[PDB]
PDB file of C-alpha atoms in Angstrom:
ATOM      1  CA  UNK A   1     -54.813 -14.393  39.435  1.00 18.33           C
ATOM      2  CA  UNK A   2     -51.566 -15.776  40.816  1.00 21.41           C
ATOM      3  CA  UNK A   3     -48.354 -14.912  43.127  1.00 21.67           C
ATOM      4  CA  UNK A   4     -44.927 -16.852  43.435  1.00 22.61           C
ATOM      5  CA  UNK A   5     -43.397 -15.796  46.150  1.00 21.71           C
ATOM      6  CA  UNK A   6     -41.259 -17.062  48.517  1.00 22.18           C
ATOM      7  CA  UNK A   7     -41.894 -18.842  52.057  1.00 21.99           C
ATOM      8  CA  UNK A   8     -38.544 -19.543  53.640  1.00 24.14           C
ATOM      9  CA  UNK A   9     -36.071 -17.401  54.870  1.00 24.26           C
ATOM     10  CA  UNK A  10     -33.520 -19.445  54.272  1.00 23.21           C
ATOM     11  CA  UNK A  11     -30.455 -17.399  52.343  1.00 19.85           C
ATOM     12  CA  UNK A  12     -27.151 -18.455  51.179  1.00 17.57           C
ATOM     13  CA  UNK A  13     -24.350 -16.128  50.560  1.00 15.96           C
ATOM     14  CA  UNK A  14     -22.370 -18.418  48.276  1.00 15.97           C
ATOM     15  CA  UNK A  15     -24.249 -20.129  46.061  1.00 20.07           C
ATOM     16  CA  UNK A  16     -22.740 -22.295  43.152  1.00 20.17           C
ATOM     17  CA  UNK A  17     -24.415 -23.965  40.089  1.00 18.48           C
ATOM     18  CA  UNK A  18     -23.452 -26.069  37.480  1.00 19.13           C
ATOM     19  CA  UNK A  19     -24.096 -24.422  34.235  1.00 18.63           C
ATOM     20  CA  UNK A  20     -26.982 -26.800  33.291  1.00 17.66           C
ATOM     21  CA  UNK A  21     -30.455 -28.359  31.952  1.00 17.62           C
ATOM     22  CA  UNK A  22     -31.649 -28.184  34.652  1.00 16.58           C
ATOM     23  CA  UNK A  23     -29.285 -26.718  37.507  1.00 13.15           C
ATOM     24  CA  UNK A  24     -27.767 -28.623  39.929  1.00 15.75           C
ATOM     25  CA  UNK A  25     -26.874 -25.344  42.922  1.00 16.86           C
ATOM     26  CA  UNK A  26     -25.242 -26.097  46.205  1.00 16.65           C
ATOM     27  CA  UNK A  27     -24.893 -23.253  49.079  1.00 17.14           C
ATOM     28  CA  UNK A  28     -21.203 -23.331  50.699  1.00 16.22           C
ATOM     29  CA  UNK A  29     -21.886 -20.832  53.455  1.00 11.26           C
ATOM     30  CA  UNK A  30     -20.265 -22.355  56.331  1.00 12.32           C
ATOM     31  CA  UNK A  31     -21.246 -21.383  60.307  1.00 16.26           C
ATOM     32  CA  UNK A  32     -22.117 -22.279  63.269  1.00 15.05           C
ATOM     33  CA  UNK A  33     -25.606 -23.635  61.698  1.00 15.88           C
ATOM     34  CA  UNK A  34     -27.142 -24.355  58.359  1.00 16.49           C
ATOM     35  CA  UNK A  35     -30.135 -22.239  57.212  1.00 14.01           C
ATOM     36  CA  UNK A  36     -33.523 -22.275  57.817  1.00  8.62           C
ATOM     37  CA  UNK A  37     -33.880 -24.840  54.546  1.00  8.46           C
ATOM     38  CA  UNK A  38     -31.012 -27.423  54.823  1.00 12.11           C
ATOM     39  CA  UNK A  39     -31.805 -30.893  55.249  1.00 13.36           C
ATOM     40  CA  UNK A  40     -28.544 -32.584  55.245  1.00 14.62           C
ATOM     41  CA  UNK A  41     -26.474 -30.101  57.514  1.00 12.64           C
ATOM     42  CA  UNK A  42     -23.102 -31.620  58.314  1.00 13.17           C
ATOM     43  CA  UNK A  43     -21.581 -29.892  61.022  1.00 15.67           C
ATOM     44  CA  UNK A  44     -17.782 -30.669  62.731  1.00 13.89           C
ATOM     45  CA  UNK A  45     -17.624 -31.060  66.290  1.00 17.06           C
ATOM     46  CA  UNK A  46     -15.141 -28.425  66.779  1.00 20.66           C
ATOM     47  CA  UNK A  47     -15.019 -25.076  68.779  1.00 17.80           C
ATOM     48  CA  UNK A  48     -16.716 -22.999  67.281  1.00 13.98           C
ATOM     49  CA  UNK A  49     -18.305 -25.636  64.990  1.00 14.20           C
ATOM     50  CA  UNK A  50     -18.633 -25.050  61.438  1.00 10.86           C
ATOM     51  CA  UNK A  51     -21.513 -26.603  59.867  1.00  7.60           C
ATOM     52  CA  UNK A  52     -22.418 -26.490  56.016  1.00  7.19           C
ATOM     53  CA  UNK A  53     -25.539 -27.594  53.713  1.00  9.80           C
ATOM     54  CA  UNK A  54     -24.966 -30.474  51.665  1.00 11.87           C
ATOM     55  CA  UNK A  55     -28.171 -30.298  49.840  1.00 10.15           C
ATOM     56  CA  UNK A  56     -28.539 -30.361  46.055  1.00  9.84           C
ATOM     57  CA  UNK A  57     -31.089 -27.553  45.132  1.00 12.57           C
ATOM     58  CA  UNK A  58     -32.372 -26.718  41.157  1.00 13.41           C
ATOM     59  CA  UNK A  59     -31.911 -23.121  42.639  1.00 10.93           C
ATOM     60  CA  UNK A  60     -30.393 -20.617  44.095  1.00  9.77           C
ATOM     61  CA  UNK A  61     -31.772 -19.056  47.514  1.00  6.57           C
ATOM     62  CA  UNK A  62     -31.529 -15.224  48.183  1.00  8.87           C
ATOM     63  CA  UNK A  63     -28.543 -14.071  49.327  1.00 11.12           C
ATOM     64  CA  UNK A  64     -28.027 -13.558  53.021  1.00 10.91           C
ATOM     65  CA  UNK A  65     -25.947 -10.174  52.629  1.00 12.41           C
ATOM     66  CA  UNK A  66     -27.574  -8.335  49.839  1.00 11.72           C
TER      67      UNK A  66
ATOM     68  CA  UNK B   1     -16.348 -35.754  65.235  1.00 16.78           C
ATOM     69  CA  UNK B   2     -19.101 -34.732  62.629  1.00 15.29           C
ATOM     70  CA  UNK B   3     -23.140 -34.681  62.918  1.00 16.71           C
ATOM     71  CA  UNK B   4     -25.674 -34.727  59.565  1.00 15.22           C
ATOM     72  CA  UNK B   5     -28.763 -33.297  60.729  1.00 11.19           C
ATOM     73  CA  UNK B   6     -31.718 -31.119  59.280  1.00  9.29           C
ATOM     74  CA  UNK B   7     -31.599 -27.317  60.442  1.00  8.68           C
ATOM     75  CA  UNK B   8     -35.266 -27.174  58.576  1.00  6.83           C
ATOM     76  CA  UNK B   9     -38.865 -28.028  59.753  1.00 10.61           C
ATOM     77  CA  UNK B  10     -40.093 -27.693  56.394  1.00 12.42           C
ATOM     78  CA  UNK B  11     -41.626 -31.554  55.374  1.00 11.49           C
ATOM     79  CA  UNK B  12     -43.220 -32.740  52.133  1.00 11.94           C
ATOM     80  CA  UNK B  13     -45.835 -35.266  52.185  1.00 14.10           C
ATOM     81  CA  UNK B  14     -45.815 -36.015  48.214  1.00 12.92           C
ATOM     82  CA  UNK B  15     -42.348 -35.726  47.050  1.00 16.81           C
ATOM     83  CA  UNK B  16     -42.053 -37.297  43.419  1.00 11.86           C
ATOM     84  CA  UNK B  17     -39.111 -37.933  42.108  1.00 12.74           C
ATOM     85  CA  UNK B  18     -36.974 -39.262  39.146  1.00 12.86           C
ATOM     86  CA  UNK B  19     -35.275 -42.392  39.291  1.00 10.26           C
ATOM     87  CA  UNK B  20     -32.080 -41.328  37.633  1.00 11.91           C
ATOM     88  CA  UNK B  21     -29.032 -40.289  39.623  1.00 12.50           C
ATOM     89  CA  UNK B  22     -28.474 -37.734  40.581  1.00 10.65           C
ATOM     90  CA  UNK B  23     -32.646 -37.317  41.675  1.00 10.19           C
ATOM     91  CA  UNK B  24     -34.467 -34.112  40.612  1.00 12.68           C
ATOM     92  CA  UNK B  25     -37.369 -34.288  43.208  1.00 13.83           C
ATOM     93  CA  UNK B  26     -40.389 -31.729  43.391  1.00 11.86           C
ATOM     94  CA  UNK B  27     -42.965 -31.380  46.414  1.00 10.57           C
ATOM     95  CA  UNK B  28     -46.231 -31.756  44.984  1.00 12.64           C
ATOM     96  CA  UNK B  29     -48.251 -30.541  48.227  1.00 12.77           C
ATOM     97  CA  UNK B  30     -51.039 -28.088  48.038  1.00 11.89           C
ATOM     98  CA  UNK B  31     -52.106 -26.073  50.616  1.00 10.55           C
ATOM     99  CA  UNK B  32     -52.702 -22.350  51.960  1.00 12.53           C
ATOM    100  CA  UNK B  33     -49.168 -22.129  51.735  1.00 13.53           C
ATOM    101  CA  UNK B  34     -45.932 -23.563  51.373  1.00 15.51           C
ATOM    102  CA  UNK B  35     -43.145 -25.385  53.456  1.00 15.23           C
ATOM    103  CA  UNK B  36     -40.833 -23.003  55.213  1.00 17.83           C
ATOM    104  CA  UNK B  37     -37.991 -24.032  52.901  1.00 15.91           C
ATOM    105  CA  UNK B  38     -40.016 -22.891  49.730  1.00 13.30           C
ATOM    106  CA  UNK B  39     -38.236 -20.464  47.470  1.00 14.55           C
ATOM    107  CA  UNK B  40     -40.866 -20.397  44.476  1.00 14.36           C
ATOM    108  CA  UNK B  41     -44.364 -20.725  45.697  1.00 12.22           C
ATOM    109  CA  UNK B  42     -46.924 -20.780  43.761  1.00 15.49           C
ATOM    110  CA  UNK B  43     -50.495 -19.658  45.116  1.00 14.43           C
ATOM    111  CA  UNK B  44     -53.800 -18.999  43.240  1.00 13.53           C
ATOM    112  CA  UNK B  45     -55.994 -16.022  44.426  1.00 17.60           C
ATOM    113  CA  UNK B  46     -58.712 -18.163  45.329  1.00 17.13           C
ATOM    114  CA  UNK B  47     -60.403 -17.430  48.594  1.00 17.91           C
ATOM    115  CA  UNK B  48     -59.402 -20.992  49.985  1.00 18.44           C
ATOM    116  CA  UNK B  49     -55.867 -19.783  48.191  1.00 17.21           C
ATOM    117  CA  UNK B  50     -54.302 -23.261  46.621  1.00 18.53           C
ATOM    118  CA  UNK B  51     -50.638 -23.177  46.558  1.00 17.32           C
ATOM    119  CA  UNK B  52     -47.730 -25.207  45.854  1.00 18.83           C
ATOM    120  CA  UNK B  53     -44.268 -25.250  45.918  1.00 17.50           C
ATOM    121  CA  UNK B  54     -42.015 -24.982  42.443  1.00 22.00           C
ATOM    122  CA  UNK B  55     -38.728 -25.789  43.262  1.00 20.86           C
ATOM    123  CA  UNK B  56     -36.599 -28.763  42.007  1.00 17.99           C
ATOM    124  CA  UNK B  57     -34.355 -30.123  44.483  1.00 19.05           C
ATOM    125  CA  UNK B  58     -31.997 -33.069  44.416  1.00 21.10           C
ATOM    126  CA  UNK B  59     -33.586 -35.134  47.830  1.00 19.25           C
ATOM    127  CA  UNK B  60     -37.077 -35.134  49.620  1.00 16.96           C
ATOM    128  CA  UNK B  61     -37.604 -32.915  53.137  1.00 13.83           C
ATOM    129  CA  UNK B  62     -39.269 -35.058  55.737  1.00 12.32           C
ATOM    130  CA  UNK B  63     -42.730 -36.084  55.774  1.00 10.22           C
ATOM    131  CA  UNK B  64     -44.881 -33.961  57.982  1.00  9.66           C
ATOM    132  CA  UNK B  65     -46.945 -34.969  60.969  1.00 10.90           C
ATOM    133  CA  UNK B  66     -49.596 -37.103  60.758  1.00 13.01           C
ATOM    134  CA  UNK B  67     -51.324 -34.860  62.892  1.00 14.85           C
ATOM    135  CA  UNK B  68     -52.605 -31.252  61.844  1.00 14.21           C
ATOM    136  CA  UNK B  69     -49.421 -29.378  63.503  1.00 14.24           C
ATOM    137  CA  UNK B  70     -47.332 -29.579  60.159  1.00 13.99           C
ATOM    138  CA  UNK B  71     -45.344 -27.514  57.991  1.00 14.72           C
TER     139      UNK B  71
END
């Protein structure tokens, strides 16, 4: 037996994808942080900062608001 | 001003990727479970459970501690 499941929390609201084999997804949520999976979070200095993931993902995470 | 940092602690000790551009990299670590940044997991339902994480991404996450304190 067998489970795939996931183990992040990370969610992105706005999630785009190139219509490909395979996908290449990006998240474009922007706040005061990045979520819980983003390696490359770029962030401006500014007040309030905004801050958005730059990774490249072959997926979409779940959403954050549904 | 502008900062590029992780917001993640999830690591991979064996990424493997390709060597075209742009990189499709996977994390081939197994373990009782999977990095905090996993969105497929896959585990076996064997006592010692063996999992592993699916997901194709286009860069590596960090690689963990040397030390037993990793995710």
């Amino acid at each position: 037996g067998y489970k795939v499941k996931s183990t992040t929390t990370a969610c992105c609201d706005s999630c785009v994808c190139t219509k490909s084999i395979p996908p290449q997804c990006r998240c474009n949520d922007m706040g005061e942080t990045c979520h819980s999976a983003c390696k490359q979070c770029i962030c401006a200095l500014s007040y309030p900062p905004i801050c958005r993931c730059m990774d490249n993902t072959g997926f979409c995470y779940d959403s954050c608001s549904k």
